[PDB]
Amino acid sequence: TASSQGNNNGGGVSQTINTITTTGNISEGLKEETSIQAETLKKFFDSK
Amino acid sequence: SVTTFSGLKSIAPDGFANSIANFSVGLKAGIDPNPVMSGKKANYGAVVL
Amino acid sequence: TYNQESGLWSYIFDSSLKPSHDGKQTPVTDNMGFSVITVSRTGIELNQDQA
């Protein structure tokens, strides 16, 4: 019910996030040399 | 007779007597004017002495 | 200063900023003049082409 609060009306415009050639580069979370790839990706995600 | 701080010899040209304590000054950023590939955003760096 | 057209940083040194006296309390006499250091970028910058 009305306990959700926020805007009563508030229709309008939505826009996707900004992007650059670096966006989606995860090369430090990809590949392996010590462990299993999901675990180094988990370390790479935890600080981010 | 290994050389230590009390005996280290400075020839420091950059206006400091001492030749052991680092210093830094005038950090400044700037947008590269050099075009980047379309759908990527303008590059920027900074430098500091 | 940075200038966006040149993509170049100008570092201004003014020798009027030197102190009046030494640690031995000797008048400092090279307190006249100034100097400019120009910094530019070097290397392959991000997002030139797919590479």
Short mmCIF file of C-alpha atoms in Angstrom, two decimals:
data_model
loop_
_atom_site.label_atom_id
_atom_site.label_comp_id
_atom_site.label_asym_id
_atom_site.label_seq_id
_atom_site.Cartn_x
_atom_site.Cartn_y
_atom_site.Cartn_z
CA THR A 1 0.00 0.00 0.00
CA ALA A 2 0.96 3.75 0.38
CA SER A 3 3.70 2.70 2.93
CA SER A 4 5.91 2.25 -0.22
CA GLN A 5 6.14 6.14 -0.34
CA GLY A 6 8.30 8.06 -2.92
CA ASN A 7 6.83 10.01 -5.90
CA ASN A 8 2.99 9.98 -6.28
CA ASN A 9 3.31 10.78 -10.03
CA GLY A 10 6.91 11.20 -11.43
CA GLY A 11 6.73 9.83 -15.01
CA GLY A 12 9.64 10.74 -17.34
CA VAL A 13 12.90 9.67 -19.03
CA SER A 14 15.44 6.88 -18.21
CA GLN A 15 19.03 6.53 -19.61
CA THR A 16 21.70 3.73 -19.56
CA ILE A 17 25.06 4.19 -17.68
CA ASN A 18 28.05 5.99 -19.32
CA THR A 19 30.62 3.84 -21.23
CA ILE A 20 34.27 3.91 -22.51
CA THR A 21 36.61 1.35 -24.26
CA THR A 22 37.77 0.19 -20.75
CA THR A 23 34.14 -0.60 -19.62
CA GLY A 24 33.71 -4.38 -19.11
CA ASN A 25 37.49 -5.12 -19.11
CA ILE A 26 37.95 -7.75 -16.33
CA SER A 27 41.35 -9.17 -17.47
CA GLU A 28 42.70 -9.42 -13.85
CA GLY A 29 39.63 -11.55 -12.84
CA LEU A 30 40.02 -13.73 -16.02
CA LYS A 31 42.68 -16.52 -16.49
CA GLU A 32 44.58 -18.41 -13.75
CA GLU A 33 48.12 -19.13 -12.42
CA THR A 34 47.56 -20.09 -8.67
CA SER A 35 43.90 -21.15 -7.98
CA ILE A 36 40.40 -21.74 -9.61
CA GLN A 37 39.12 -18.96 -11.97
CA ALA A 38 35.84 -18.24 -10.10
CA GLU A 39 37.83 -17.58 -6.85
CA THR A 40 40.22 -15.00 -8.42
CA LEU A 41 37.18 -13.38 -10.13
CA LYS A 42 35.53 -13.34 -6.62
CA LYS A 43 38.66 -11.53 -5.23
CA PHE A 44 38.53 -9.12 -8.22
CA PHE A 45 34.79 -8.42 -7.58
CA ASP A 46 35.06 -8.03 -3.72
CA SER A 47 37.06 -4.72 -3.92
CA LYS A 48 34.65 -3.49 -6.72
CA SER B 1 82.02 1.43 7.67
CA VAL B 2 78.77 1.01 5.72
CA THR B 3 77.36 4.49 4.76
CA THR B 4 74.40 5.67 6.92
CA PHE B 5 72.23 8.88 7.12
CA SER B 6 74.71 10.74 9.46
CA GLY B 7 77.46 10.27 6.75
CA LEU B 8 75.50 10.08 3.44
CA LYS B 9 76.81 12.79 1.04
CA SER B 10 74.21 14.97 -0.78
CA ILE B 11 74.81 16.40 -4.28
CA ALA B 12 71.11 17.28 -4.53
CA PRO B 13 70.55 19.72 -7.45
CA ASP B 14 66.83 20.41 -6.77
CA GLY B 15 67.10 23.08 -4.01
CA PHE B 16 67.18 20.66 -1.03
CA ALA B 17 70.23 20.10 1.23
CA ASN B 18 68.97 16.54 2.05
CA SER B 19 69.08 13.68 -0.59
CA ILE B 20 66.86 11.10 1.33
CA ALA B 21 63.29 12.58 1.81
CA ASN B 22 61.08 12.58 -1.34
CA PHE B 23 58.85 15.58 -2.12
CA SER B 24 56.07 16.21 -4.63
CA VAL B 25 54.22 19.36 -5.80
CA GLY B 26 51.59 20.69 -8.29
CA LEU B 27 49.30 17.77 -9.07
CA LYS B 28 47.19 18.87 -12.11
CA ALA B 29 44.71 16.95 -14.33
CA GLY B 30 43.81 17.46 -17.99
CA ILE B 31 41.58 16.08 -20.80
CA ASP B 32 43.57 14.72 -23.80
CA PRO B 33 42.47 16.74 -26.87
CA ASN B 34 43.41 13.71 -29.05
CA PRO B 35 40.22 12.10 -30.39
CA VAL B 36 39.22 8.69 -28.95
CA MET B 37 37.17 6.08 -31.00
CA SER B 38 33.40 7.09 -31.11
CA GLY B 39 31.20 5.56 -28.33
CA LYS B 40 34.23 5.86 -25.93
CA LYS B 41 34.55 8.95 -23.64
CA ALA B 42 37.40 11.53 -23.77
CA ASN B 43 40.70 10.48 -22.00
CA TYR B 44 42.11 12.39 -19.01
CA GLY B 45 45.25 12.12 -16.90
CA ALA B 46 47.13 13.99 -14.23
CA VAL B 47 50.83 14.68 -13.55
CA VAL B 48 52.78 15.72 -10.43
CA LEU B 49 56.47 16.56 -9.87
CA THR C 1 48.37 25.38 -15.71
CA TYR C 2 47.03 22.89 -18.21
CA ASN C 3 45.98 23.95 -21.72
CA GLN C 4 43.34 21.70 -23.38
CA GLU C 5 44.28 22.66 -27.01
CA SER C 6 48.04 21.75 -26.63
CA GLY C 7 47.38 18.84 -24.20
CA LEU C 8 50.40 20.28 -22.26
CA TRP C 9 51.03 21.22 -18.52
CA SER C 10 53.13 24.35 -17.65
CA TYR C 11 54.97 24.32 -14.27
CA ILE C 12 56.06 27.86 -13.20
CA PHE C 13 58.95 28.26 -10.67
CA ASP C 14 59.48 31.79 -9.20
CA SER C 15 62.85 32.25 -7.33
CA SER C 16 61.35 35.22 -5.39
CA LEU C 17 59.82 32.47 -3.19
CA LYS C 18 63.33 31.46 -1.84
CA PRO C 19 63.77 32.46 1.87
CA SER C 20 65.74 35.67 2.75
CA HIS C 21 68.41 33.72 4.77
CA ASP C 22 70.20 30.31 4.82
CA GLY C 23 70.39 28.02 7.85
CA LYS C 24 73.71 29.85 8.57
CA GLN C 25 71.77 33.21 8.36
CA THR C 26 73.68 34.23 5.13
CA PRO C 27 71.57 36.51 2.85
CA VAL C 28 70.26 34.35 -0.09
CA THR C 29 71.17 36.14 -3.39
CA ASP C 30 69.96 33.74 -6.22
CA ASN C 31 66.33 34.91 -5.50
CA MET C 32 65.88 36.57 -8.93
CA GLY C 33 64.24 34.89 -11.92
CA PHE C 34 62.02 31.93 -12.71
CA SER C 35 61.77 28.77 -14.83
CA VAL C 36 59.04 26.85 -16.76
CA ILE C 37 58.82 23.03 -17.03
CA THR C 38 56.48 21.75 -19.78
CA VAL C 39 54.99 18.23 -19.28
CA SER C 40 53.56 16.25 -22.24
CA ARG C 41 52.07 12.66 -22.47
CA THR C 42 54.12 9.72 -23.94
CA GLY C 43 53.02 6.19 -24.97
CA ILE C 44 49.94 4.46 -26.44
CA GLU C 45 46.82 6.06 -24.82
CA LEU C 46 43.49 4.19 -24.11
CA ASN C 47 40.87 3.82 -26.91
CA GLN C 48 42.70 4.81 -30.16
CA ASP C 49 41.34 1.74 -32.06
CA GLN C 50 40.06 -1.78 -31.17
CA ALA C 51 43.61 -2.63 -29.84
#
